[PDB]
Amino acid sequence: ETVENVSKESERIWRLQRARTILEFEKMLPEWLRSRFRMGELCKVAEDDFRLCLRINEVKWTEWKTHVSFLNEDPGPV
Amino acid sequence: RRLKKRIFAAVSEGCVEELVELLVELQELCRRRHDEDVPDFLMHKLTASDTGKTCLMKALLNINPNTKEIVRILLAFAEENDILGRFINAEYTEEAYEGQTALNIAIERRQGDIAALLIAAGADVNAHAKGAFFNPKYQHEGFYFGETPLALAACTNQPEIVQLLMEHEQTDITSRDSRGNNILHALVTVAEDFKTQNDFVKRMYDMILLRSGNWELETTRNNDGLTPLQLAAKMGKAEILKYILSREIKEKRLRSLSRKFTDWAYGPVSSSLYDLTNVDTTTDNSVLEITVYNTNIDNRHEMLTLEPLHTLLHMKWKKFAKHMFFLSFCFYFFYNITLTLVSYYRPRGWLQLLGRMFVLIWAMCISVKEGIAIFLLRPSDLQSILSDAWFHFVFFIQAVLVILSVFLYLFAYKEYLACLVLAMALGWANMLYYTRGFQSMGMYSVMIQKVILHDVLKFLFVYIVFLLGFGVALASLIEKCPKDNKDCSSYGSFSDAVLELFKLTIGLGDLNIQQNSKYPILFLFLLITYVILTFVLLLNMLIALMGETVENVSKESERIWRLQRARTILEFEKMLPEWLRSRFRMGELCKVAEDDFRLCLRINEVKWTEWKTHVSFLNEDPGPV
Numbered sequence: 001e002t003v004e005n006v007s008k009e010s011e012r013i014w015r016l017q018r019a020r021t022i023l024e025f026e027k028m029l030p031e032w033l034r035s036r037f038r039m040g041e042l043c044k045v046a047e048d049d050f051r052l053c054l055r056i057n058e059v060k061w062t063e064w065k066t067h068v069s070f071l072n073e074d075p076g077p078v
Numbered sequence: 079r080r081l082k083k084r085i086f087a088a089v090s091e092g093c094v095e096e097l098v099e100l101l102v103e104l105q106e107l108c109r110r111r112h113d114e115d116v117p118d119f120l121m122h123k124l125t126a127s128d129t130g131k132t133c134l135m136k137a138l139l140n141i142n143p144n145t146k147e148i149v150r151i152l153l154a155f156a157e158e159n160d161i162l163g164r165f166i167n168a169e170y171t172e173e174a175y176e177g178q179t180a181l182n183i184a185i186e187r188r189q190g191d192i193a194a195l196l197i198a199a200g201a202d203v204n205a206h207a208k209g210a211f212f213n214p215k216y217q218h219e220g221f222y223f224g225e226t227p228l229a230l231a232a233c234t235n236q237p238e239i240v241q242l243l244m245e246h247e248q249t250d251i252t253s254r255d256s257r258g259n260n261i262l263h264a265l266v267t268v269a270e271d272f273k274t275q276n277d278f279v280k281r282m283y284d285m286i287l288l289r290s291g292n293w294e295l296e297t298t299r300n301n302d303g304l305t306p307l308q309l310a311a312k313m314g315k316a317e318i319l320k321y322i323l324s325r326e327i328k329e330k331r332l333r334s335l336s337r338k339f340t341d342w343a344y345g346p347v348s349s350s351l352y353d354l355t356n357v358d359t360t361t362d363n364s365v366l367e368i369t370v371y372n373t374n375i376d377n378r379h380e381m382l383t384l385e386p387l388h389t390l391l392h393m394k395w396k397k398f399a400k401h402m403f404f405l406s407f408c409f410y411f412f413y414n415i416t417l418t419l420v421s422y423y424r425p426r427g428w429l430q431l432l433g434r435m436f437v438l439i440w441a442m443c444i445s446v447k448e449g450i451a452i453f454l455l456r457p458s459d460l461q462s463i464l465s466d467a468w469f470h471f472v473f474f475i476q477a478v479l480v481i482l483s484v485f486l487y488l489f490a491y492k493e494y495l496a497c498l499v500l501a502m503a504l505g506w507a508n509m510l511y512y513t514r515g516f517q518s519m520g521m522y523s524v525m526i527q528k529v530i531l532h533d534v535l536k537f538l539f540v541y542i543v544f545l546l547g548f549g550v551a552l553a554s555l556i557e558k559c560p561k562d563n564k565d566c567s568s569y570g571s572f573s574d575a576v577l578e579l580f581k582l583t584i585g586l587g588d589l590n591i592q593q594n595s596k597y598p599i600l601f602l603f604l605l606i607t608y609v610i611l612t613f614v615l616l617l618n619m620l621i622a623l624m625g626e627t628v629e630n631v632s633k634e635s636e637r638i639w640r641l642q643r644a645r646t647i648l649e650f651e652k653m654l655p656e657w658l659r660s661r662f663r664m665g666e667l668c669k670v671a672e673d674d675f676r677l678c679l680r681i682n683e684v685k686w687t688e689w690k691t692h693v694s695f696l697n698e699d700p701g702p703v
């Protein structure tokens with residue numbers, strides 16, 4: 001009975017336990033060697049707005065909207 | 079100058095009041111002596127040399143409420159300059175988006191009205207977008223759709239543009255891209271599961287195929303030599319494969335394109351004929367062969383449940399496969415029986431020598447057959463070993479052990495008996511392969527594989543850590559036996575400690591806690607901890623964990639057994655020679671009066687649901703003949 005109740009959520013618990021290890025290891029790193037951050041500054045807004053952003057690509061054949069709220073006209077990564 | 083930048087900036091924003099003001103200035107510049115020619119200078123100033131992007135393509139990338147007004151003005155401006163042909167057909171020069179034109183951008187932006195006037199203006203409806211983005215190496219840095227405007231609208235769920243493009247006289251439906259894929263191939267690659275796509279590809283596949291009205295598009299092979307029907311099996315698109323395999327075209331004037339035909343129907347009882355020209359073992363590469371031996375997909379068991387595929391396997395199973403499977407079992411059963419008797423009754427004659435030679439000869443036959451079977455299978459992934467070639471190795475390993483034992487027997491090495499015993503234990507363990515063919519035993523066998531991998535292997539890894547972890551600990555606090563009694567403690571060494579704990583786990587022997595331990599309380603504390611961890615925790619939890627896996631597998635183990643059994647059917651059929659292939663399906667049937675004879679499989683179904691009028695049959699008489 002407990003296995004059935006936990007198996008549907010044990011995957012999330014393992015990631016929660018693993019995520020604790022990731023933060024502990026990152027704190028062990030010194031002031032230097034922190035070159036493993038995410039993508040650098042990106043001009044999100046033309047008004048001198050640069051933010052560190054994480055790139056995630058998703059595919060969804062559901063809505064089929066017109067893209068008029070993008071940042072770069074060229075779709076190819078560069 | 080800065081005129082080009084201003085034109086692009088005004089075009090992107092979507093303003094037409096100053097758009098004409100910038101264009102009339104360019105017309106004034108045309109009066110200036112270019113010294114080379116008029117059209118080239120105008121095109122150069124109206125296009126970006128770095129990437130090849132034009133102002134018209136800039137507007138379509140920047141769809142605005144006034145974009146349609148901009149497009150007409152730009153086209154009229156180009157038409158007045160007699161550069162309309164080379165302007166609307168301009169494409170990017172960079173390899174990232176090479177071949178992309180204005181028509182491609184408009185279709186992607188879902189601008190049907192804008193794309194409609196572009197085609198009438200003279201847009202190239204056969205442009206190929208051979209850029210790197212349109213043909214990505216992976217599924218994240220690009221989007222492959224067929225690099226053609228006809229396929230782009232098809233893959234983006236835009237039937238209105240597809241109908242407009244197909245009706246155009248200059249559209250090449252059978253056009254092939256760099257991969258050699260046609261329109262139908264691109265839909266197969268684009269097609270996904272129903273939970274992801276709203277079956278628009280299947281509807282789009284039917285619409286485009288009916289418009290062409292010919293088998294040239296369906297029989298086209300790409301650079302990999304695969305038809306769209308074969309590509310669905312190669313990429314594991316069950317939704318597309320199901321439609322194509324069971325395809326009925328009710329409307330007249332075009333019926334040969336169908337793959338499913340009802341020769342007769344009387345009330346709810348009707349018989350269906352499924353085309354098998356490209357789905358059979360007769361051809362070199364077919365859907366049936368691909369859907370069974372595929373290793374890049376994990377939905378083969380679902381793909382074998384289709385109406386033609388499931389029945390085709392069943393029909394050939396009861397003809398030759400059933401007898402060959404039983405014959406193979408009898409030869410292998412006698413192979414192990416004879417091997418066991420000679421090894422068990424070994425010395426420590428002239429009439430039984432034939433049996434001994436049978437084992438040696440049959441071992442060579444297994445070794446040769448399994449040697450090439452693994453070679454042609456090309457196993458790469460670890461899962462493929464345990465899901466497609468596990469019995470191809472253990473049979474090979476057992477066979478070569480007998481050969482190795484014979485090789486060591488004639489020499490002075492006495493290790494031949496050790497290899498001979500391993501052949502016996504593995505040979506009888508290999509009998510579980512023949513459990514297939516029977517639904518009850520076959521589903522039981524596939525249950526064992528999931529239990530072993532998901533639970534047994536996981537359980538053993540933790541148990542060994544506790545077994546060895548407490549083995550060193552318990553043996554550590556053991557004093558040396560006195561000179562009088564040399565067997566004071568059973569936990570004398572590490573090997574002894576593990577053996578006692580192993581017997582404790584399986585409930586064998588007697589638990590004697592009066593060992594020669596300098597800390598008897600500590601020694602007993604670890605023993606009780608080991609029992610709780612193993613006897614109470616690890617052993618009991620394994621039963622509960624497998625019950626979760628049994629529930630998840632029992633709802634799909636039947637399909638897995640058929641998938642495993644179907645692999646045996648194809649292997650047995652390949653063993654047949656060139657002749658003896660008289661066990662095929664029903665012969666040629668006049669599906670269409672235009673000399674159209676196809677090998678078809680007859681399936682009879684009864685359905686008291688729709689109660690339609692049968693006007694799309696092949697034979698008026700319902701009685702079989």
Ligand SMILES: CCCCCCCC/C=C\CCCCCCCC(=O)O[C@@H](COC(=O)CCCCCCCCCCCCCCC)COP(=O)([O-])OCC[N+](C)(C)C
Pocket residue numbers: 542572573576
């Ligand atoms: C599922 C299965 C479970 C396991 C089953 C376990 C039970 C079976 C396992 C084992 C039974 C015994 C077999 C091997 C015996 C070797 C011990 C030895 O020689 O010790 C010597 C002392 O050695 C030392 O003083 C050095 C210690 C390090 C080497 C030995 C431990 C290895 C650790 C590995 C670390 C990595 C481990 C990685 C994995 C954790 C004593 O030797 P001796 O008395 O002089 O020997 C007489 C002969 N001679 C004189 C010619 C030399």
Ligand code: NA
Pocket residue numbers: 584585586587
């Ligand atoms: Na007992």
